[PDB]
Amino acid sequence: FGVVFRASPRQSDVMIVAGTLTNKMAPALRKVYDQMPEPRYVVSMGSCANGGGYYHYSYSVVRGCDRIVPVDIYVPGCPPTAEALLYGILQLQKKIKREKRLRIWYRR
Amino acid sequence: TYKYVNLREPSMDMKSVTDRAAQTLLWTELIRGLGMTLSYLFREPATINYPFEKGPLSPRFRGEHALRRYPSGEERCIACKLCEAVCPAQAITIEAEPRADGSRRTTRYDIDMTKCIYCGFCQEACPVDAIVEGPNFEFSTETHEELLYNKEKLLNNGDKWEAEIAANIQADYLYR
Amino acid sequence: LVSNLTLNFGPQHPAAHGVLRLVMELSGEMVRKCDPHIGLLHRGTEKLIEYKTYLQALPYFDRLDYVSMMCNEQAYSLAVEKLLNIRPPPRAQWIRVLFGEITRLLNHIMAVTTHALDIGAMTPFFWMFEEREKMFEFYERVSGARMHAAYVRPGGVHQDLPLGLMDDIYEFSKNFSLRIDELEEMLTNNRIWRNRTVDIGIVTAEDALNYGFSGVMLRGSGIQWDLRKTQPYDVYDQVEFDVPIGSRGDCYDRYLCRVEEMRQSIRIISQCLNKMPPGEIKVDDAKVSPPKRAEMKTSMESLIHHFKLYTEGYQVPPGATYTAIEAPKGEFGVYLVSDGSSRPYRCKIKAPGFAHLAGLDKMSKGHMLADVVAIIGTQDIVFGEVDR
Amino acid sequence: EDNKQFFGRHRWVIYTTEMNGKNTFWDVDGSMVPPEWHRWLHCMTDDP
Amino acid sequence: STSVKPIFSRDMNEAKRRVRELYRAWYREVPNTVHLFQLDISVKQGRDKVREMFKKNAHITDPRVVDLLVIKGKMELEETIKVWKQRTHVMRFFHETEAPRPKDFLSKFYVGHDP
Amino acid sequence: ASNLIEVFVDGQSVMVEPGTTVLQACEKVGMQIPRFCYHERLSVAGNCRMCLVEIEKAPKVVAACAMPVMKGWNILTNSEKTKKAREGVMEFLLANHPLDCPICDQGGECDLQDQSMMFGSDRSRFLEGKRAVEDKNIGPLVKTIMTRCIQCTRCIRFASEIAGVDDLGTTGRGNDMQVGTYIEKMFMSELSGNIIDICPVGALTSKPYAFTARPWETRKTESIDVMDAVGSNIVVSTRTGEVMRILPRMHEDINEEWISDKTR
Amino acid sequence: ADTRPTVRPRNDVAHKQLSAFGEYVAEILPKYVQQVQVSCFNELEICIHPDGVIPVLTFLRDHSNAQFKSLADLTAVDIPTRQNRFEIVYNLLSLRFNSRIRVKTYTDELTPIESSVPVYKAANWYEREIWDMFGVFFANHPDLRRILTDYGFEGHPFRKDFPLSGYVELRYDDEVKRVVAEPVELAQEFRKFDLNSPWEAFPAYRQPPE
């Protein structure tokens, strides 16, 4: 589809937060996010990243990455099937296809 | 029992040594690895053309939770709160009252889908095959709130996938 | 200490084992001290389980070593059965042993392929991960979940194999031995592979035992030890296989113990597709394993049990036990206390990686930086089990 | 469908160029397969 | 009885040496932290907090307990000096975001059922 | 005093006043023989025969709830002769009991349920059909699904001796025996609500509380009653920050374990 | 081994053996050993006074008949009711004799335990976990500090009187451009079930009354 397997943080367009997010690991998540050159889209994959999943009530868990970054797509499942995630990506591409960046600019 | 995976003592006869010498100075082994890859270049790749094709599943597959109905139309859930008592992630919230006709039925039934772990214990526990995991696995949303299903969102899945949920159970309930 | 580097895996390369923040000290290029920081994936598993019934707690064990799913479930199940003083039926024990070796194939495929990925050898990853897929389908068709099954359970398994499964499992096993040869043809004799592994990460037999190493981190050092052949649990006293043994105790041997083991599983799977007996698949004691639906929907004595066993759970006699299994990574094991009620009082987990990682500093002394890459991989570390 | 193709690619679909009053000439997605066919296209069963 | 195994010290007199040394350790270090973590507070305030932290445990008199506080204090000090903490962790003694919770009875009676 | 006597529970001596029952003899050593008909505050009836226990060196198991002890008995409370008695008895109770646990209010706090697990067998051989009784209507509080009854004669005894209104009774014989008033009557009494507690099975259940909650999801906050100056002790049971029901709290010096309807 | 498939077949051979090897140790090291018992499913326990942490483990590592080279595991178990709340546990595997044995001790919040790193190097990280998660202090530990918990995290989570959800929760506050820790408030409170049954289950373990 065009989704290369591995891209460095500075060359990336979409972050995929696949897995749990413990408090200790939260600060580095944001630090990486802020370094993403725009436009930047965040995809939350799995139950532990949408809402803290199985470990929702644990003391050392962040209850969803949306507490730490603005998410664009939520892929549910523990874990989502590889095909379920692929649908999530193909969902984003349509979302990027409905933007009106120029039109909005043209009418300011 | 056991066996030594690396205990060889290469023979030091001239032919043997010349082989090792012939290997180093001419990259024979490295070539042999290139042969293997060159074969994969001429095999049909294992790629399925999704979405026009779908990776095979099985009738036991666990997907989006859904609420079923009897053939008549009545609801199957009777607010027995067993699914709520075993859901390991405590993602099921039930609140029931006697219905206007005296029946026992729920009023609140939310399955937070961000705490569910798709374990499948809910349907294993329901004594009336009410809450079942449909086979749908493509319902990723664009906001968090859309994943906080409430009873109205669960039935509609029931009234939307029953044409397949019913078929699967028929296929697999015998193993249960 | 010419200069200290806080090497962090924030930009996690395609490892799928977690992120490790490593604190090091390079005296130029050598490593004079390597310090791992691990807590990044500590979710509190060992404390949540305090609040869960013995059944509700099982899925947590698919989420410690998330490449050895059913193997973990077997360890937890064996511990509980031992506490409950009950014996599963033979057909289940064969299914569990059948899958316990299928998972070992899944795990070793992950270890070798990624370990070869971190060193740039990328192609073998794809070939072998196409075998994992077909191996997931078997996971898929018996439980319904591609990865996390919860299939194995205290008192046996959940459901029986669907008709026609073993025909496929046999078909899969028939072709697999060629796949490995397609792999060894790449890495086994390749000079570059040997350079990155030969005489790297050498561990002496005497030090390994003291440092708590288990599994292939022992057999690489020539020690003859494998819990299956020495303290068998389910049926492993009924299958012919040879335990690979290392000679020089370096990375390359531990790469050959794993590849060799992946063959020895095809030798066990072959046997389990022949000795599988007819019968039921859960202990015929409806106070521990829930009854069949048809009997739940017809008989009162059964209906009650389906009720209590899914709301209160099944009590367990008070007592403590340490149970370990030859999990693919090492000696996975759980020390699990029980106070008599339906909720465990404590569940310590002996993740094999946790011991190995401590030994990382020892093995990286007097090694170049790029060897720390190889050393971590050869230990086969997944940080789900390490931090828990 | 085509039964000479390896298990996984034998059965495929070509989504309609319009559904529920929306142009899907290009914008198809995997949630456009009604449940009845949904079971056959995923090899969950054999009888269409 | 009253006999109990010691940890490090054996009487309040021994302990305070460690405590006093600990203050010496922190006091010399607050300035660098402020520059190191690019913090945005005055070196005066940082040293004020340390005095506040040391002051909240004045009434402690058991020598064993005082040993622990130092051991944790030393550990916490090690993290900062070695920069294992991060600019987020250091600023967590200040509560830059939590609202000022009133202490007077009357205001509490207005907000909520807090006892 | 010298009136005490020595009796043995599984070989262990214990001193008990004369006239004490076996069941009460086993209480003093922490054993608790099962029980359906017996309530320590209700006159002995001894019909459920679920308390049958074996006394060593005797052919016939005695019913603990009624049989007094004798000098120097050895009460085998765990012998295979006692166990088989309980599984047999517990088998009959579930012979015609209905499959109502998933919708039965009592479900989750049911003595027939728990005692079935800890004493009874675990699979059924009853291949016939089941009894099925019509449901009475004895007030706007006590819902009654009498199919679930097990003829334990608690409601009957409690009403006669405690409440003082004897409108309850048994009418018929054999498997068709039934519990009720035999007419269209409301068992209305200031203490009526209690019979919900004593009825060990989910036959009598609170109508207002029906279908609202399960016993395992409620937090029990011991409290006091203020409806009247009797100062009854109660256990407010909340759920998600809302009061769901009220239950008596034992206090021997105030209210034993009953509370009036207004309180309840 | 009896034709009762739904029951675990005992092993009397290994029960007698471990009883023998238990009495054996109780006589060699009577200075510390307080109690030795064997579980009916063939496991051996050596309860000791905390002082004998080094002598007892050193003996089991070197003696000709012990040879317990490998420390399988090392953890703790809190028990509030006991005065000495914590309870350290050592599980040792003897590759020579193909056997296991468990050694248990006790302590409290303040009193420290003698670090057993010198005997087994494996016990280095484990002893930080115990310190990290429970708060027990190990004297002479080469390097002791929190391992699992977060930097600046306060409290010992696996204690019994530490609430499940903890005390603080991180989040990102745009005003201060950093993650910030705030008092924990939950959208849905954890639902504590009362899953026990009011009926004695196992007569064997019945405790004497008052």
Add this chain to the structure above:
Amino acid sequence: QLITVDEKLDITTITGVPEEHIKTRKARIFVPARNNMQSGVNNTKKWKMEFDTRERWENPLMGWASTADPLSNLVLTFSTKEDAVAFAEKNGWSYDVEERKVPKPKSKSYGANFSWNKRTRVSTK
């Protein structure tokens, strides 16, 4: 070898509990009352320590029951009243104690159901 310490034991400064949850909370020590809907007394054995209730409020979105009290679900078990208290003091929680209320013995006599001249004579079975 051993030092002599006489003070009153306390660890509140080495547990990490915010002061707001030390001087304000009111731990409660008691033996749970038997659930009156059943007859088994196997839950009034041990001593339980639990803290006072606090505010729970409907969630604006899903109507769930929210809360900001970390100790709401906390419950500790003890074997004796003294051990329960000794845990409260050293943790610095103000506590209340409730005495165990064991049932008083009673005279059960089947024959009393049939008395020639007493009111114990039952009327139905």
Add this chain to the structure above:
Amino acid sequence: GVRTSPTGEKVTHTGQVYDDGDYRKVRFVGRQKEVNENFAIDLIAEQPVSQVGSRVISCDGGGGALGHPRVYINLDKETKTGTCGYCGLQFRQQHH
């Protein structure tokens, strides 16, 4: 069985609908309030009462192992009918 409140919001079978003054209903602005319109309490009244010739009749929702647990219903009371606990279907003893 579908009705619209004066607010302009269809009422769910549970009988919950935001009143006119409430603010939460803003959440539906720009979107739609999901509601299932197969009101069960209606589809169960449509089904006719089955006539049987015995005091005690048993229902299991049809399908046997795919229905609710088997129960027995006593039909003596002619002043009303007999209704299944789980599925709600009604029974009456004929012409008695």
Add this chain to the structure above:
Amino acid sequence: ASATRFIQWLRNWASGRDLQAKLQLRYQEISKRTQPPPKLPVGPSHKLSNNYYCTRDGRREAMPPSIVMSSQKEKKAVSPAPPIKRWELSQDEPYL
């Protein structure tokens, strides 16, 4: 399983094996996705007589540990068990 005659020889020559025998892709040897209904067996305790639970109750058998030596209350030296017997090489393939 469609590669022309020529290509099949090629990738066989390169890889050296005979790939056309064992194909990494599944074509027809897969099972049928619609299998006939099964009839699973029951366990050994499914009987109607001489099946009393107390005789086959696993949980009640366990006992508290036997206190070998408690502090409150010529002989030979014994190892925990006989030394583990040396393993024997594999006659199937003693060396890789």
Add this chain to the structure above:
Amino acid sequence: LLKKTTGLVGLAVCETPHERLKILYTKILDVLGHIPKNAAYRKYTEQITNEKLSMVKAEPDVKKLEERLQGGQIEEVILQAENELSLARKMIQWKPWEPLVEEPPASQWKWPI
């Protein structure tokens, strides 16, 4: 006849196992003198150590001697032998034979609570 390698990495092949064992076994026996006879450690250590010592003398060939000791390769037995000496040394200062140092509180090991 001497092995090319013991097998366990970090274990060099010894040349004089019998002399090396006899010296070590002799030394082990020496240390036990300074341990009171009553101590169970001495009698048990002596009993086994004598059994091993005799087997050293009788068997003249390296190989079968291992099958008598059963301590795996011959080098390991030496390495095991060194430990027993080092263990025997330390026991002197620890004095295990002394009575129980202290008794635990009443309910220390009671379980379940």
